[PDB]
Amino acid sequence: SSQIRQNYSTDVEAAVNSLVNLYLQASYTYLSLGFYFDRDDVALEGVSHFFRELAEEKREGYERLLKMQNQRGGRALFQDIKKPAEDEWGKTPDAMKAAMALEKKLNQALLDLHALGSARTDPHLCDFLETHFLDEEVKLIKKMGDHLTNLHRLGG
Amino acid sequence: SSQIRQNYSTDVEAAVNSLVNLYLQASYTYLSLGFYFDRDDVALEGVSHFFRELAEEKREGYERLLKMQNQRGGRALFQDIKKPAEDEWGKTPDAMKAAMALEKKLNQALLDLHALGSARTDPHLCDFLETHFLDEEVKLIKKMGDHLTNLHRLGG
Amino acid sequence: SSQIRQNYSTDVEAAVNSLVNLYLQASYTYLSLGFYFDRDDVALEGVSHFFRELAEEKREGYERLLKMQNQRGGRALFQDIKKPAEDEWGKTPDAMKAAMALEKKLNQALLDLHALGSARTDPHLCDFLETHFLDEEVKLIKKMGDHLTNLHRLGG
Amino acid sequence: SSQIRQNYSTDVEAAVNSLVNLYLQASYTYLSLGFYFDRDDVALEGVSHFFRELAEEKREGYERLLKMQNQRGGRALFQDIKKPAEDEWGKTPDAMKAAMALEKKLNQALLDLHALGSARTDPHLCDFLETHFLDEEVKLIKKMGDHLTNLHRLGG
Amino acid sequence: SSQIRQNYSTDVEAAVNSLVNLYLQASYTYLSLGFYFDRDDVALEGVSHFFRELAEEKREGYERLLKMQNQRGGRALFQDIKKPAEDEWGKTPDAMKAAMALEKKLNQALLDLHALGSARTDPHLCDFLETHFLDEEVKLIKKMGDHLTNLHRLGG
Amino acid sequence: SSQIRQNYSTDVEAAVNSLVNLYLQASYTYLSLGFYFDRDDVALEGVSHFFRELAEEKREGYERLLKMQNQRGGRALFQDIKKPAEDEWGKTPDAMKAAMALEKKLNQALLDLHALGSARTDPHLCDFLETHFLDEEVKLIKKMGDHLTNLHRLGG
Numbered sequence: 001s002s003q004i005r006q007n008y009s010t011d012v013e014a015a016v017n018s019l020v021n022l023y024l025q026a027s028y029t030y031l032s033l034g035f036y037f038d039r040d041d042v043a044l045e046g047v048s049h050f051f052r053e054l055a056e057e058k059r060e061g062y063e064r065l066l067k068m069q070n071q072r073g074g075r076a077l078f079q080d081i082k083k084p085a086e087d088e089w090g091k092t093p094d095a096m097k098a099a100m101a102l103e104k105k106l107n108q109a110l111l112d113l114h115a116l117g118s119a120r121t122d123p124h125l126c127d128f129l130e131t132h133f134l135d136e137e138v139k140l141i142k143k144m145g146d147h148l149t150n151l152h153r154l155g156g
Numbered sequence: 157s158s159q160i161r162q163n164y165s166t167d168v169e170a171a172v173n174s175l176v177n178l179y180l181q182a183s184y185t186y187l188s189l190g191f192y193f194d195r196d197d198v199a200l201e202g203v204s205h206f207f208r209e210l211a212e213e214k215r216e217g218y219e220r221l222l223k224m225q226n227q228r229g230g231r232a233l234f235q236d237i238k239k240p241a242e243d244e245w246g247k248t249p250d251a252m253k254a255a256m257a258l259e260k261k262l263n264q265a266l267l268d269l270h271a272l273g274s275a276r277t278d279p280h281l282c283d284f285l286e287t288h289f290l291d292e293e294v295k296l297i298k299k300m301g302d303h304l305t306n307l308h309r310l311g312g
Numbered sequence: 313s314s315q316i317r318q319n320y321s322t323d324v325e326a327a328v329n330s331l332v333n334l335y336l337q338a339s340y341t342y343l344s345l346g347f348y349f350d351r352d353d354v355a356l357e358g359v360s361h362f363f364r365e366l367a368e369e370k371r372e373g374y375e376r377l378l379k380m381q382n383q384r385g386g387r388a389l390f391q392d393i394k395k396p397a398e399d400e401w402g403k404t405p406d407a408m409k410a411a412m413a414l415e416k417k418l419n420q421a422l423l424d425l426h427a428l429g430s431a432r433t434d435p436h437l438c439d440f441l442e443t444h445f446l447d448e449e450v451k452l453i454k455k456m457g458d459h460l461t462n463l464h465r466l467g468g
Numbered sequence: 469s470s471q472i473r474q475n476y477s478t479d480v481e482a483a484v485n486s487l488v489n490l491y492l493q494a495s496y497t498y499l500s501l502g503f504y505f506d507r508d509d510v511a512l513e514g515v516s517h518f519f520r521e522l523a524e525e526k527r528e529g530y531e532r533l534l535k536m537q538n539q540r541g542g543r544a545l546f547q548d549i550k551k552p553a554e555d556e557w558g559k560t561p562d563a564m565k566a567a568m569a570l571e572k573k574l575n576q577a578l579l580d581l582h583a584l585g586s587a588r589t590d591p592h593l594c595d596f597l598e599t600h601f602l603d604e605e606v607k608l609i610k611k612m613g614d615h616l617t618n619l620h621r622l623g624g
Numbered sequence: 625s626s627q628i629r630q631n632y633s634t635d636v637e638a639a640v641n642s643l644v645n646l647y648l649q650a651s652y653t654y655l656s657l658g659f660y661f662d663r664d665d666v667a668l669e670g671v672s673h674f675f676r677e678l679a680e681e682k683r684e685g686y687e688r689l690l691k692m693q694n695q696r697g698g699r700a701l702f703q704d705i706k707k708p709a710e711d712e713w714g715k716t717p718d719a720m721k722a723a724m725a726l727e728k729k730l731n732q733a734l735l736d737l738h739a740l741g742s743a744r745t746d747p748h749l750c751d752f753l754e755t756h757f758l759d760e761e762v763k764l765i766k767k768m769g770d771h772l773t774n775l776h777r778l779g780g
Numbered sequence: 781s782s783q784i785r786q787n788y789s790t791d792v793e794a795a796v797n798s799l800v801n802l803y804l805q806a807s808y809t810y811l812s813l814g815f816y817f818d819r820d821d822v823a824l825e826g827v828s829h830f831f832r833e834l835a836e837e838k839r840e841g842y843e844r845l846l847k848m849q850n851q852r853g854g855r856a857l858f859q860d861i862k863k864p865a866e867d868e869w870g871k872t873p874d875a876m877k878a879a880m881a882l883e884k885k886l887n888q889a890l891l892d893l894h895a896l897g898s899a900r901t902d903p904h905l906c907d908f909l910e911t912h913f914l915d916e917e918v919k920l921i922k923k924m925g926d927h928l929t930n931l932h933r934l935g936g
Contacts, residue, residue: 004613004664006572007579028648028702035690035700040628066659071610076659078652081705104162111163114279123582124606127598130283138280142227145160145352156467160352184336184390191378191388196316222347232347234340237393260474267475270591286595294592298539301472301820312935472820492808496858503846503856508784534815544815546808549861613664624779 002073009120013074015113016065022109023062024081026102030055032084033095047092054099057136064132072124093151100144107137158229165276169230171269172221178265179218180237182258186211188240189251203248210255213292220288228280249307256300263293314385321432325386327425328377334421335374336393338414342367344396345407359404366411369448376444384436405463412456419449470541477588481542483581484533490577491530492549494570498523500552501563515560522567525604532600540592561619568612575605626697633744637698639737640689646733647686648705650726654679656708657719671716678723681760688756696748717775724768731761782853789900793854795893796845802889803842804861806882810835812864813875827872834879837916844912852904873931880924887917 030051037048069076089095110133117125186207193204225232245251266289273281342363349360381388401407422445429437498519505516537544557563578601585593654675661672693700713719734757741749810831817828849856869875890913897905 002613002664003568003616004609006575006609024652024705028705031690032700032702035694038691038694039699040626040694040697066655067662070659070662070664071606073613073664075663076656077711078656078707080707081648081652083702083704087701100159107162111279115277118277118279121583121586123579123586123594123598124602126279127602130279130286130598134280134283138227141160141162142352145158145229146355146357148159149353149355158352180340180393184393187378188388188390191382194379194382195387196314196382196385222343223350226347226350226352229352231351232344233399234344234395236395237336237340239390239392243389256471263474267591271589274589274591282591286591286598290592290595294539297472297474298820301470301541302823302825304471305821305823470820492861496804496861499846500856500858503850506847506850507855508782508850508853534811535818538815538818538820541820543819544812545867546812546863548863549804549808551858551860555857610664614667614669617665617667 002075005073007122007124008072008074009116009122012113012117012120012122012125013069013072015116016069016074017077019109019113020062020065020069020076021079021081022106023058023065025084026106027055027058027062028081029084029102030058030099032086033089033099036089037095044092047095051095051099061133068128093148096144096147096151100141100148103137103141103144107134107141110134110137158231161229163278163280164228164230165272165278168269168273168276168278168281169225169228171272172225172230173233175265175269176218176221176225176232177235177237178262179214179221181240182262183211183214183218184237185240185258186214186255188242189245189255192245193251200248203251207251207255217289224284249304252300252303252307256297256304259293259297259300263290263297266290266293314387317385319434319436320384320386321428321434324425324429324432324434324437325381325384327428328381328386329389331421331425332374332377332381332388333391333393334418335370335377337396338418339367339370339374340393341396341414342370342411344398345401345411348401349407356404359407363407363411373445380440405460408456408459408463412453412460415449415453415456419446419453422446422449470543473541475590475592476540476542477584477590480581480585480588480590480593481537481540483584484537484542485545487577487581488530488533488537488544489547489549490574491526491533493552494574495523495526495530496549497552497570498526498567500554501557501567504557505563512560515563519563519567529601536596561616564612564615564619568609568616571605571609571612575602575609578602578605626699629697631746631748632696632698633740633746636737636741636744636746636749637693637696639740640693640698641701643733643737644686644689644693644700645703645705646730647682647689649708650730651679651682651686652705653708653726654682654723656710657713657723660713661719668716671719675719675723685757692752717772720768720771720775724765724772727761727765727768731758731765734758734761782855785853787902787904788852788854789896789902792893792897792900792902792905793849793852795896796849796854797857799889799893800842800845800849800856801859801861802886803838803845805864806886807835807838807842808861809864809882810838810879812866813869813879816869817875824872827875831875831879841913848908873928876924876927876931880921880928883917883921883924887914887921890914890917 034048034052034055036042037044037051066076086098089098110129114126114129114134117129190204190208190211192198193200193207222232242254245254266285270282270285270290273285346360346364346367348354349356349363378388398410401410422441426438426441426446429441502516502520502523504510505512505519534544554566557566578597582594582597582602585597658672658676658679660666661668661675690700710722713722734753738750738753738758741753814828814832814835816822817824817831846856866878869878890909894906894909894914897909
């Protein structure tokens with residue numbers, strides 16, 4: 001066991017590795033969404049930019065998780081990253097709907113990880129998630145909801 | 157149910173609405189305290205200012221609660237705001253005692269809301285309350301306690 | 313009677329207290345309108361901002377009335393603040409129509425208060441209302457009228 | 469009971485006093501480590517500085533605990549501070565090993581105090597520890613681990 | 625076929641997609657190398673930083689390829705990203721050797737892609753690779769070679 | 781014996797260690813006085829600050845003694861630090877009286893240490909005490925005397 005490890009569940013270490021994979025997958029999805037909207041037959045630079053910036057934010061997420069893993073004396077273990085669910089993402093609203101479903105999945109994974117830490121009485125992990133993840137997710141999901149509402153109003 | 161709503165108890169949504177009413181009521185009490193001290197036959201501008209600034213801080217509180225309500229996909233529901241408990245607030249120490257009793261009530265309402273979220277396993281709500289409310293209340297109550305101690309020393 | 317009181321009708325003092333309640337109620341209505349438009353299923357930040365800024369302006373109104381009440385040696389008396397007339401405010405035009413009806417009510421209350429002061433030969437009160445209220449109301453109502461006209465043009 | 473005290477367990481108050489003693493003891497240990505490395509027959513200014521700065525950080529810790537104790541209406545109670553465990557601390561790696569054992573002790577005391585507050589449903593205390601202590605400890609322990617690894621590489 | 629597509633081989637489009645996968649895989653390898661060196665029992669921040677910066681440079685690579693794909697009217701197609709070849713990367717020289725083998729693989733893939741474009745008489749593709757890739761690879765490989773030489777001298 | 785040691789009595793070395801303990805004890809007393817005055821039922825921030833600043837000055841004292849000990853080739857030896865004489869310090873004048881008694885004790889210890897060095901013909905030690913301690917003590921004691929005189933005038 002690492003010389004620094006203290007109050008860090010092997011279950012949490014593993015769940016952190018799984019969550020890093022989920023974030024790697026999410027960044028990948030946003031990379032695909034971003035370049036789809038840069039297509040000449042789609043051509044929405046603002047939408048492309050929105051998704052490309054999200055790819056970066058998800059990368060920031062998995063980098064923070066990996067840093068924390070090392071801070072706690074856990075050990076990063078990487079798996080294959082699944083390709084995104086679609087090759088073509090439809091119209092802006094279809095894409096935005098896909099994005100909020102992805103964020104809801106990530107948020108559930110965060111909530112599950114928090115519940116796991118709570119069960120293992122790990123307040124460092126709790127504080128980490130609250131500080132860097134939970135509210136970021138709530139804010140983002142609210143933003144996507146607002147977008148979907150406004151996109152729906154277009155044509156009316 | 158809102159398209160964004162996730163892990164947000166209807167009980168918490170309702171308790172948030174009730175707490176917004178309690179803050180609306182508290183801001184109202186401080187408005188009354190502030191103008192009482194601006195009376196020509198009371199005439200304590202520093203005390204008036206103290207209470208007027210608290211009215212603003214309680215407004216900031218209920219605005220933050222309402223913002224959070226919307227962020228979570230809950231729905232603001234407003235009720236009548238009860239008038240303050242007194243029309244005339246006595247001497248500075250009587251007023252300050254009324255103020256710390258009000259803050260203790262608010263703090264208990266916060267603690268109760270936190271316990272409710274804990275019971276509903278809502279770490280976003282926990283983080284929100286800890287970040288924006290709990291310590292603010294502790295600091296304020298400490299400040300009021302110190303004031304009461306110093307007011308009591310006057311005449312001695 | 314206050315040591316400073318001079319040419320200040322008890323009828324005016326009471327009407328000022330009633331008008332403070334009407335402004336408290338109006339600020340409350342604008343708070344509700346503002347957060348309604350911040351809903352994820354409404355999502356119009358510019359409209360939300362418009363109404364939130366009006367809530368602030370109505371607060372400025374009742375604070376000015378209360379200051380004047382004390383300046384004249386009158387005595388603030390607070391009553392319960394009625395909740396807003398709706399929990400949900402419809403589309404932007406429905407909301408704006410509600411807002412101009414509210415402003416017309418306030419303006420009538422101002423005009424009535426002015427007539428009361430005129431009857432009681434209170435030129436200080438007249439000057440106060442003219443300086444801080446009457447033209448503000450006319451300008452605002454004109455702005456709302458212009459908005460309603462432009463909103464009606466949308467879809468055409 | 470203090471006029472400000474609310475939701476503050478006598479058990480927590482006592483545990484806070486005990487933790488202040490543990491921090492006083494830890495600052496003392498770092499004072500001794502710092503001056504040991506300033507000896508002419510040891511003469512490692514960078515190591516001396518490292519430990520002297522830790523003495524300061526532990527002082528900051530117990531000052532923050534004492535401030536919080538007063539903020540909550542608890543009452544500071546001081547006991548004798550035990551002298552450090554060694555008069556002479558060996559080579560840099562021996563010293564660093566002593567330091568990480570000390571930090572692990574402090575971290576366990578923090579975790580125990582957090583568990584106690586959780587049991588007493590004290591979210592203010594939770595937030596205080598998370599904000600000012602837990603992550604500071606994790607970061608420091610990680611830093612010490614890294615040092616031990618690098619010191620071990622010297623001679624190779 | 626895209627409205628913009630001109631002189632762009634379907635073979636090149638496919639080879640570009642394959643090369644994007646190879647770069648995604650290479651960035652992933654560098655992410656793993658970077659966090660390995662941030663381990664408390666490895667603890668070489670300069671090496672960690674070196675590899676983390678390479679992860680970024682490989683991301684820049686695949687982003688440039690994807691941009692070019694769209695510029696030419698080709699269509700991004702994403703596949704699963706294979707996990708890195710090792711979970712633990714040994715000592716600095718083992719890691720650096722792994723890195724230069726990776727860069728040699730990438731460089732061969734670039735050279736192969738260039739040969740393919742040459743065969744398809746695609747001078748835009750040639751210029752793109754020469755401008756953004758070939759010399760970058762040569763410089764990097766030279767840097768890694770120099771590192772390996774210097775690492776080998778350590779202990780001597 | 782240290783390679784640097786010259787004209788440094790073992791008696792002086794020991795007396796320096798004892799004086800470091802006396803300063804550690806004095807800083808501890810001032811820490812307790814400082815937090816006592818920060819109590820909500822005492823609440824004198826200026827008095828609290830006065831004593832907290834003295835805690836710092838006594839720390840500066842024992843750090844200077846320890847530095848000098850090492851400069852001379854003596855060896856720091858630490859003992860348990862006795863807790864302060866009171867848990868509660870009364871009114872400001874009681875506290876200030878306690879403080880001047882403490883300073884008089886420290887000053888006597890300094891004077892005794894100076895006499896010891898004089899007996900051992902140690903002019904370096906003499907200069908050290910004169911430069912960093914003696915006049916500081918005289919100035920501080922004068923300041924405390926002035927305070928006691930002024931506190932006594934309050935109520936009159």
